[PDB]
Design a protein around this motif. Structure first.
Motif, PDB file in Angstrom:
ATOM      1  N   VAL A 100       0.547  18.438  13.806  1.00 30.18           N
ATOM      2  CA  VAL A 100       0.487  16.977  13.658  1.00 30.18           C
ATOM      3  C   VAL A 100      -0.582  16.578  12.641  1.00 30.18           C
ATOM      4  CG1 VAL A 100       0.137  14.787  14.830  1.00 30.18           C
ATOM      5  CG2 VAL A 100       1.205  16.698  16.038  1.00 30.18           C
ATOM      6  N   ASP A 101      -0.140  16.111  11.474  1.00 33.42           N
ATOM      7  CA  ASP A 101      -1.062  15.696  10.415  1.00 33.42           C
ATOM      8  C   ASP A 101      -1.942  16.870   9.988  1.00 33.42           C
ATOM      9  OD1 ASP A 101      -1.572  12.804   9.269  1.00 33.42           O
ATOM     10  OD2 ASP A 101      -0.599  12.553  11.174  1.00 33.42           O
ATOM     11  N   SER A 125      -2.779  19.602  12.037  1.00 36.86           N
ATOM     12  CA  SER A 125      -3.679  19.971  13.135  1.00 36.86           C
ATOM     13  C   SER A 125      -2.917  20.731  14.214  1.00 36.86           C
ATOM     14  CB  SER A 125      -4.294  18.702  13.743  1.00 36.86           C
ATOM     15  OG  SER A 125      -4.652  17.807  12.699  1.00 36.86           O
ATOM     16  N   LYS A 138       1.029  21.279   6.818  1.00 38.26           N
ATOM     17  CA  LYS A 138       1.244  20.088   5.997  1.00 38.26           C
ATOM     18  C   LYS A 138       0.864  18.804   6.745  1.00 38.26           C
ATOM     19  CE  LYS A 138       4.456  19.781   2.100  1.00 38.26           C
ATOM     20  NZ  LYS A 138       4.366  18.317   1.841  1.00 38.26           N
ATOM     21  N   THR A 139       0.030  17.993   6.097  1.00 34.51           N
ATOM     22  CA  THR A 139      -0.417  16.731   6.674  1.00 34.51           C
ATOM     23  C   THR A 139       0.690  15.684   6.583  1.00 34.51           C
ATOM     24  OG1 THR A 139      -1.403  16.145   4.543  1.00 34.51           O
ATOM     25  CG2 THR A 139      -2.859  17.119   6.201  1.00 34.51           C
ATOM     26  N   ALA A 140       0.462  14.531   7.203  1.00 35.43           N
ATOM     27  CA  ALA A 140       1.449  13.459   7.184  1.00 35.43           C
ATOM     28  C   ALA A 140       1.732  13.015   5.754  1.00 35.43           C
ATOM     29  CB  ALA A 140       0.943  12.280   8.000  1.00 35.43           C
ATOM     30  N   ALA A 141       0.746  13.193   4.879  1.00 38.39           N
ATOM     31  CA  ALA A 141       0.887  12.805   3.476  1.00 38.39           C
ATOM     32  C   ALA A 141       1.597  13.891   2.676  1.00 38.39           C
ATOM     33  CB  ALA A 141      -0.486  12.549   2.877  1.00 38.39           C
TER      34      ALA A 141
END
Length: 101
Positions: free
Chosen positions: A43-44, A46, A74-77
């Protein structure tokens, strides 16, 4: 709970599979494996326990220190960050097999 590393050696991680030779409780030695994908989520960028579908958004996973799991998620971005998590936090050793606790 966990602390499989206390009775587990020759551990290895590659992608989302933990494999390590552990001392059986009845027999001798047993080398099983446990997909961290059924107990880890991304998640984001993490890694958290009690989760799943993290490997799909993570790669380059390996064993760090002894009972830690380092990997890129991979992060939310859409950016791969450096995520870490202690395997001993839950991953235990039952009858020489790697279980989740």
């Amino acid at each position: 709970l966990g602390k499989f590393s206390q009775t587990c050696y020759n551990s290895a991680i590659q992608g989302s599979v933990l494999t390590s030779t552990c001392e059986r409780t009845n027999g001798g030695y047993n080398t099983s494996s446990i997909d961290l994908n059924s107990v880890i989520a991304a998640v984001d960028g993490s890694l958290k326990w009690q989760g799943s579908n993290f490997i799909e958004a993570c790669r380059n996973t390996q064993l760090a220190g002894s009972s830690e799991l380092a990997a890129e998620c991979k992060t939310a971005a859409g950016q791969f960050v450096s995520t870490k998590i202690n395997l001993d936090d839950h991953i235990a050793n039952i009858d020489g097999t790697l279980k989740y606790e």
